[PDB]
Design a protein around this motif. Structure first.
Motif, mmCIF file in Angstrom:
data_model
loop_
_atom_site.group_PDB
_atom_site.id
_atom_site.type_symbol
_atom_site.label_atom_id
_atom_site.label_comp_id
_atom_site.label_asym_id
_atom_site.label_seq_id
_atom_site.Cartn_x
_atom_site.Cartn_y
_atom_site.Cartn_z
ATOM 1 N N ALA D 277 11.541 -21.036 22.228
ATOM 2 C CA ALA D 277 10.152 -20.189 22.268
ATOM 3 C C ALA D 277 9.146 -20.765 22.894
ATOM 4 O O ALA D 277 9.127 -21.937 22.283
ATOM 5 C CB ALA D 277 10.292 -19.501 21.017
ATOM 6 N N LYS D 334 5.451 -17.403 18.011
ATOM 7 C CA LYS D 334 6.413 -17.918 18.782
ATOM 8 C C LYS D 334 7.060 -16.675 19.418
ATOM 9 O O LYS D 334 7.203 -15.507 18.845
ATOM 10 C CB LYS D 334 7.441 -18.559 17.920
ATOM 11 N N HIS D 336 9.987 -15.506 20.383
ATOM 12 C CA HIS D 336 11.486 -15.236 19.990
ATOM 13 C C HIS D 336 11.537 -14.670 18.587
ATOM 14 O O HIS D 336 10.749 -15.051 17.590
ATOM 15 C CB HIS D 336 12.322 -16.555 20.093
ATOM 16 N N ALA D 339 12.968 -18.037 16.096
ATOM 17 C CA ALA D 339 12.551 -19.227 16.712
ATOM 18 C C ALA D 339 12.997 -20.540 15.980
ATOM 19 O O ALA D 339 12.452 -20.440 14.839
ATOM 20 C CB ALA D 339 11.197 -19.278 17.347
#
Ligand SMILES: [Mg+2]
Ligand SMILES: [Mg+2]
Ligand SMILES: [Mg+2]
Ligand SMILES: [Mg+2]
Ligand SMILES: [Mg+2]
Lengths: 382, 382, 382, 382, 382
Positions: D277, D334, D336, D339
């Motif tokens: 990420a 981040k 994602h 992450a």
């Protein structure tokens, strides 16, 4: 036949284990109500500086702290020790206080410690019938330390830790230690029992006082009691809060959820049922009237539930509560990760006017005030 | 031991409840065949203008309508009433006719009404052993209205709605109504029983006659009988249709699926077994020969099944049917959301020539016509 | 920049391919509106006895049939030929008629044939921006037979079938056939184009004219137009039906869903927006006044939309429709498998009376009338 | 080419929108660093009694509250109004304070209000590159009330609310109200802009001042800053907490996660990188020396980062931070939902002593000291 | 426009990096074919005693080993060092040899070492267009040791390791080591490049030379070339094996799958296409005649493909291969975790005999011979 119950009883603890640092009180798992629900309960008290020694069980437990504050440590298998001090290293220490719900994974060791002045009091729903328990429905607690008294005596008709069952020589060879250390690992003359007292205080590494950002640090606790967490609210009747897998995701794997409800003086939580889960009510404060009805239309419980009492409300049975003069507060453990309930005012809104008239021989004038006149929600101020 | 059955019987309804507007006939859940399968069946008939009053049960039901047409309403918890008329508002009304399969979610209230001239006849698979039922295996029906006769009498050795178990005063306070209305809500002198008769006709809001595009409006019905839905077809032998979770996605949560098969005069549905589900056959029309074989190689059923009869075909047991002179039509309920079956002509194609020769002492000439000579599918025209 | 459009237009087809047994009219995929939505549309017409020759494309297409009835046949890779005649065998034949929606999977060959007297008219949403398309946004149609004119010629700046690119010799070797047959598979001097007429008629194995109980027989069609399918209804304003992945499971893998709305004379589908998907409206009948507003409060579209016209309403833009003299009917395709919308009356209900007051300088009583008066659903009868 | 950046800069806000009850300062979404990460940031300030008017955007935004306390209210489509007062009703009110992170779903209207004396300062990560955004990377904010100045004017080369694009007449018809009210909903001569002051105070239904137990009441906030939430800790260097989808389930559908790290005087968060990420650091307190290295071994950023500054560290680039005179605190967003990062001390442990030797020309004993000495976790105390 | 390619070429490596213990030859990622597929390839060679130094990239790479045998070691973040010697400890060592496929996760460091006499030759598919890569399509390789020459220099218009971008002082502080050691970690005057020779040999802990039973020890390799792994086989034509996520679960998160096909002298893998994925063929042995047809019926590629050559066959384009004098063997990488293909003989079987007749102007008997004669599978022996 397990749930064909003609009457239900407001149950209080049957057994008691006094320990050095605290007290464990258990409900008998053989009570017919608890067998229907497939669970048993346990009330644990840790006195000031009380340390509940490390243990694990083959089923999940959902615990609500109703008094005090402390720390809980879990020992997750193969996860790194992310708390270190330049010397001792260990895993993450989690803090709890009253109103919190804690969740213990099957087979994972955990220990708790009382951090305040007052005693910590917590009631635990031991979900013995969970699909994750592959042994049998008896409650079991495996202790890694001390010499514990039997917590669920009925499973039999003082014991030892799982380490006392091995010889000091095999433990010395196994943990690369000297036999003197190996000897103490099996708790030879320990009479303190399972909740000891840490003299002077305990000191562990904690801010408030490998890596793995994923599974090794999973959230295993959430507050359910604080007023602001209410999901339903009527300032004249009460509030309801739901804790499930959409809030605490690990619950999807353990099959439990819970609600915390607070009824103000004379507030009604009108007729309702749980669609897919058995429930277990534990009253934390106050008293009030509760009426449970089964499929034959008979009231299998009709009376006052009060602090310290447990009441099982089986799946689909219709419940209704009313707080007394002091109001009523309780937690409801349910055996589903996302348990849904339904209340009758809402079922009437959903049904056409005429099937409601034809069903209860009501006029349109009467169906219309049933349908649109309230107090839309389940909390009624009478 | 539940499925170690030496013989299987073609069962017909044991109990009968005549009601004002219709009739309910049930199979006894204690029959050994039905205990193996973990289910019981119910046949409901609604006469012209018959209204089956609102009820719910703690397990899913899969219902096939074999005659008539009507409407079904469900009361989904907290979902908006999307049908409104400038005055009555209510939830979506669904229409069904013969050949349709309906699915009732656990704990969700539902009511049905006969819309035609002829009586609606529907047979329901009550899946009492479903993982969603957390009570016990007894059939149970909780009624929200009327005074119902006991539908599954065997669970005991007239009853009331779940509302009659509460007092008129607590119901008046609870639904913010007058005590006169509250009194009728508990059906005090109702003798019509659970399926009443709506005089003049019922009128609900419907085209053919919040928002939530997701869960509140989930498809809960699909036709399985219409000729064009066939998944397998041989114009000289018959057709098979499968209804499962790839067609109706809610079935993934309730664990059921079904097939509808039609065998033409002398058509064979050659030797086959269900790999992962118990089955329950209900013959809707005609008659024919059926032979079920267990793991010891013994025929535990060998005879004619005909309209109105129920036959359990346990998991992995090999079945084979043949329509008589009038042909044979039946529905097969299976206890898996995606039940798969396998037939022996297909197993022979899949096995090497030589393990087939060595297994049945056949020559290559004989293995080759077994393997490639037909009538590839399971429907054989003899 | 693609959805930063200060004007929106009602679009009509640009190109036209004339065939022996039908017609195709496409919308240019280069229109700014179509590029924002990442889709393009195609209206196909099959005259009586019209066969659209087998073809596949690298993206999914959702098709609503607005006139006629016919049969469609897919060719799923590796699935058994379950329809058989003792002499042909082939995969399942599905039947369709007006009001039905059909989904054609990425890379799966399909053919359709008109079974009625009148022509089948179908409009297809080609979702070229789909994650399943690993080539590029240009519409591609790979034909297995005939010599097709390019349906979407814009995305190029007649052709052949994919088998014509192979020599007759290799094709004869590859399929173990003679050169006379290998040669005809190339479609050498076929001037009929992609939709041909079948003189006499086409006759395939169908009831109405190995396994898989699962994947090889998956549901790919569903009726959306019929009145009884309504999910929302107000008898004085119109109805709305939703077709998504809770109704047709394949849609979860293709990213598409749809709605069919019918507004009666002056019925208003009050201001609303899609939270998670772009949509494409196609008017199937009638006329109405449509309004679309962007994030600056500018009505990027404000006028009549009539039958045959296409309008793109981008994700989150607020739309509102009003039915004309004779009402307005239209299908809305959406680029999400489970697309959700929200209507403003409903968000007023969700917001505290006081932030509404401060937001629009309204008095307690005017806020009060917006929240609780009306017409609760999205369909308003003025 | 977008992440092929040979230099990285510490960014400050570019634009500023002054409002009656607050301030908004945005970062230009055209900065190369921000374009690599596919995100843009916005710092909002609500002065005392400041109400940010209801608005939605087509992407998710993660918000950390760095000062003050307030209430947020979302408007979920079709969910019931569970807070009620016997006279208003509305959806659940959530409370927040410093250290809390909040997630606003795609297309869901939200409003916030300051409940303390001091101003609420919050920085929001607008994730315009999110898969849920089907329009384009330009930040869009659709307001339901007021006349807003564009917060992100770069992505355009004052405006109104989405209701102003409709005439007062149609709005009066659509919501069944008079023209006086329909007219005020357009916000005709409102010069207060998007954040207004509420003189007297705002008062909504809250404990601290139908169903759904599921989806309509989903958790959208969680505290990340508190010391006790630390996932990693070294009392001589600092702490790190991670907030991802194992803690807040909604995040799995939005693609975001975050960390909050606190470094004490000279504490080093030793060299590390994010595997999956891109991240955006925002310093909330203090000052420290940050270093970022790309795949060529070039320190694309090497200098101090102080409070108020933003730094983008692209996926896989190796970062290292050191706390200043007074330590360094910062939130890292981040892209994602879960992450993961890795730190180099830990990968040295994972690799055989001999490939380390051959890789860096080290002796057995120097390899030995890197693998087993130190400081095992990512926080180093020098 | 990227896959609108009217010509396709058989590609060979463009660049070459010479190293002390090996060689790397890359394919330019700017070739139109490679850009359509969103991938680039790299052929690595490790000479005897060759160690490819630890490195990671932001996308997954699938690698087939065509010659030699060696060991690979990954460094998973936070996982325990389960191989230990009472003195080193490190993570699991995996062994490989020819025919094996290996998957390297996004952001996970890996190193390989040659354990045989002969050189290891491996071709790697770098999937730069993968959803897991949040940077951009430029190939990036982050080295933890040495001074590497850029393997893919095209995507730039020597370098160092990521640790060289940090000073020796900070590195000494960060890893609690001396400056002599911190200095050698920067790789100051190392001219060996990314693949070094290990004189004497490398010796790590291996059987053949905390937990996690789960994630930390996940399978990342699988043999695809061995004869016994064949999924399709005709002893007179060749074999095909498929490696996807039903065989190697990690692949579901990386979007890759593969096939290995072997054609014997004149064996035909008859006309086919991939429904959902682009593919990249690399010939490992032999020579054959490959043909690829686009949607216009044009053979975009029609010629011999020999060992060492690479050919991109885009999604849905129809390919056909024929084995040369000595047969043809090749690995096909595909950009879907579960990529499905379809072959035309099989779709002829799925379609009714009469639409085939009308489609190609064939007679009942010629259709009859195509459907049922042959060679049923995709491998044809002429
Ligand atoms: Mg309750
Ligand atoms: Mg059968
Ligand atoms: Mg619309
Ligand atoms: Mg960082
Ligand atoms: Mg191939």
């Amino acid at each position: 036949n397990e749930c064909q119950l003609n009457n239900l009883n407001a149950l209080e603890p049957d057994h008691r284990v006094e320990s050095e640092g605290g007290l464990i009180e258990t409900w008998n798992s053989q009570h017919p109500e608890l067998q229907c629900a497939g669970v048993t309960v346990s009330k644990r008290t840790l006195n000031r500086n009380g340390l509940h020694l490390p243990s694990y069980s083959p089923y999940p437990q959902m615990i609500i702290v109703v008094q005090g504050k402390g720390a809980i440590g879990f020992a997750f298998p193969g996860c790194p020790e992310t708390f270190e001090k330049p010397q001792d290293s260990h895993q993450k220490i989690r803090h709890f206080n009253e109103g919190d719900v804690l969740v213990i994974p099957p087979g994972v060791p955990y220990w708790t410690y009382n951090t305040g002045d007052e005693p910590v009091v917590a009631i635990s729903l031991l979900d013995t019938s969970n699909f994750n328990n592959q042994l049998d429905q008896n409650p079991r607690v495996f202790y890694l330390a001390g010499n514990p008294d039997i917590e669920h005596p009925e499973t039999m008709q003082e014991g030892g830790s799982v380490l006392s069952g091995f010889s000091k020589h095999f433990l010395a060879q196994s943990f690369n230690t000297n036999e003197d250390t190996a000897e103490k690992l099996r708790s030879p003359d320990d009479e303190r029992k399972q909740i000891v007292t840490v003299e002077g205080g305990l000191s562990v590494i904690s801010p408030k006082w490998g890596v793995e950002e994923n599974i090794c640090t999973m959230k295993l606790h959430e507050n359910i009691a604080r007023p602001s967490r209410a999901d339903f609210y009527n300032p004249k009747a009460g509030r309801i809060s739901t804790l499930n897998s959409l809030t605490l995701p690990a619950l999807r794997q353990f099959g439990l959820s819970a609600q915390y409800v607070v009824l103000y003086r004379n507030g009604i939580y009108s007729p309702h049922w749980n669609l897919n889960a058995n429930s277990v009510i534990y009253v934390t404060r106050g008293k009030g009237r509760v009426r449970v009805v089964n499929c034959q239309g008979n009231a299998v419980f009709d009376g006052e539930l009060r602090r310290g009492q447990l009441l099982v409300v089986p799946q689909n049975f219709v419940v209704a509560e009313q707080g007394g003069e002091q109001g009523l507060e309780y937690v409801v453990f349910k055996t589903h990760h996302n348990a849904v309930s339904s209340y009758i005012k809402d079922v009437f809104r959903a049904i056409p006017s005429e099937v409601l008239s034809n069903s209860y021989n009501l006029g349109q004038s009467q169906v219309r005030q049933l349908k649109y006149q309230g107090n839309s929600g389940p909390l009624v101020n009478p």
